[PDB]
Point group: D3
Chain length 186, copies 6
């Protein structure tokens, strides 16, 4: 198939590359063509050349790459810089962790997790973005290395995180992992 | 923005609705417009009206809704009908469950899980589809109700599954959940 | 220039001819091309092939030719069939006649005009439609034949009417003419 | 609906705004959509990118806003600057005034109207442009203030003018008003 | 590259295949892409959906495949059916043969060639069509088998013909060949 | 008809003029419209605005005008500059001349033709280009002036050449002419 999209000028070459990959993948959820067979053409318009409601329109500035926002937030959390982490978040951000623990304060999380392990470090196997009609949703998964509270090291403990965004800011985090499954029981 | 897509005749009204929603969401990963502002127009062509390589082309039949394939497979598994379940799968299907247990045989899974709970039943909170350039990827999550092996009932145990597909068939399953986190320890 | 327009199926061949003439004339208010040089192409879409807001849309049924509505109302008024005339009108229809007389009741008009002439009959020289962003506006003009109240005949008395419409119904009438200019003064 | 128009480069942002409003209104004479629902996209082409008859074409320079030409001519006439007024006119310009008086010379008009009032000054309620296939046609109307020949002042006397243009110049004027209707009769 | 063409309904699937191959080859005279990379999409319009000069237009019926017309004429000439051959021709058809002999009458040709060989039979190596802006031009070439006037057989004598057409009928024929080069000289 | 073509930026105004004439003529092999009725519009895209296979693509640099390449080679051959002539040619270039003589070496040709005439000079009546799906093919024809080996002059001897190209270089030459037909026989 061939996809054309009409948009106002002002998007970067990198924003366009994202949009083009995104449209190409959307086609592949219905049409089992290889990416190589799918064309995306973008038609950029000056403000004077576009009109809706008999008025000119001003383009909404692009959203940031949601997957990179998510990675940057989780990197900031591993560096323990909470002041910076809170800048990625909506005022009503909610996280849910294993056991169903629901928290709204990043410091509540740190208290809670101290009892569960000394530290943990994420290795990422993959980021997937799920385009929805309420904006993008980010899934990332891979493995954890760390130490149980007695200093015993572990590695390779599967994890997965899900983030919902709102106007580029993180609004909901959900977390699932294999920690309780691999924890030693004496 | 306005999206046009050119495709050969032969897709159903329902396949088109999927493709149109999918393209609309793709736009929203970069352009923070509301769905209401985004138009998708589909231009359908008879075979005589399309030519690539100076030849007519024959359309690849649509892929099934991946999320519905996934739901149907997991429903079949809850009914214990393995013969039917295997028809959803590629010959090299691989599942990975908590602890990192890797299995290729649906009967291996049933043996293994019998030791972990009497039964479990999924309530779905959400299906998300992640369009990628290797085809769609399905994420679903919600909660489990069941009984521990001693007959003790539990409900509301968070879970998440991830499926990768290949030409409409399920090729990779990954599973993460809160069972070991909620299991009673005596 | 070349004009394309994308619309949902359901318009008649005659509604399309109106729309095509209308778009062709719009171009000529800025570009001094002859009609012969201007192309209009209409792209008709089945409901399954169009999507805004990730939903299908249902086309608003065409407006009637405003100039013909206006002619039909004025013909009905010349036949004195007020019951039928009132069906062309909005509930708040207002007419303004020479001297600035403002009336909302068709019977008020008949009372008033009886003192001004025995009868009058319109010959139309032209109908012009003014496309605006509040819908079409109709101008028609030509001459009147009739009799002054003493039975003296006149012909060829210039007149002009202006109508504003609202959802196909007549909402405002304004009238200007040469009657008082040609009336005999003894 | 969605309207695309293909045109050669060289039109101003203001000429485009006129053309876009004009096309938007044309749609509304048939399709009862609100302006807000109607999109106009203009595709501008360099000369090297357009070909008709296997040759490049040179764009006809835009027509001036006909309504503004008309206003400027009538303002010049109120200032009594006939030398400048004649520059707006075709060589065969014809005016028709109440009683059907037909004149081709602006000085003939001034002679004639001196007997009818001392002076008159237009207040404009509205300009409407009627796109036709012989070019734009301008209608304007509102009220007159002035003095009858005995110095008696009047205000609020309804008037309407109609202009036909030809290649940007005024070619036909028609006038209708309430003066004879409001003139005092002693 | 991607080529779209807009045309009125009424062309056959075979006329479209010709037009699509023809447009694909035109691209390849400038852009060194393989045919496989070049897409042609044809947009067919009902009469009600197309307008030029504010009127509907009626499509000119397709031209026949010029190469097949040429082959059919030359086959008819080999069968000696002149009555049928003349139906392929314009009233002013002109042929030019080796030595520059110019003839307008098919019977003149037969007289002339009788002195040159007993008979000759064409084997075609290729037909090429040259799209020009005065319509298509056909070139065909291959070899001749026959007998010199003394009954001596020859084969494999190179030839080439060129035809210019006019509204589907043959208007000019030019011929060049190796006969005089291979004729035996005693 | 109306033709649009979508291409990457980087073609000259002259390459576009060729492509536009070429597409216009292609239409005329099926649709008997005059060139004046046929529109070609070229849509040029920046690399950031085009994507196939979810990657940006780099345009293949234009082919040179094949007819001009052919003329330049034949002009170089008339000047006897073989070193320069060989630069127009593929490594496997093959020429076939009257009698079917097949040669791969430009010096072989010069030896052979010395026995046939003192010299010859081409006057061109026409170049035609035949767009095919293996690239352009060039036909040129007109007349020869020269001298037979005894110094006797001739003029006006019809000739025709055909060239097949490959990636802009000449790959096959075929030649047919009236020399043996006009040679004097004593």
């Amino acid at each position: 198939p061939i996809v054309e999209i009409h948009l106002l000028e002002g998007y970067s070459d990198a924003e366009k590359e994202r949009l083009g990959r995104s449209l190409t993948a959307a086609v592949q959820t219905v049409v089992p063509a290889p990416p190589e067979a799918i064309t995306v053409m973008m038609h950029e318009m000056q403000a004077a050349d576009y009109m809706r409601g008999a008025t000119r329109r001003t383009p909404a500035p692009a959203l940031p790459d949601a997957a990179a926002t998510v990675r940057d937030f989780l990197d900031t959390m591993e560096a323990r810089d909470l002041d910076k982490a809170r800048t990625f978040l909506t005022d009503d951000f909610v996280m849910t962790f294993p056991t169903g623990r629901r928290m709204t304060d990043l410091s509540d999380l740190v208290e809670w997790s101290a009892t569960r392990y000394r530290f943990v470090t994420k290795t990422y196997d993959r980021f997937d973005t799920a385009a929805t009609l309420d904006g993008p949703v980010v899934y990332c998964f891979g493995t954890l290395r760390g130490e149980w509270p007695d200093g015993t090291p572990f590695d390779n403990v599967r994890f997965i995180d899900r983030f919902a965004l709102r106007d580029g800011k993180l609004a909901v985090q959900d977390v699932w992992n294999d920690l309780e499954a691999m924890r030693p029981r004496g």
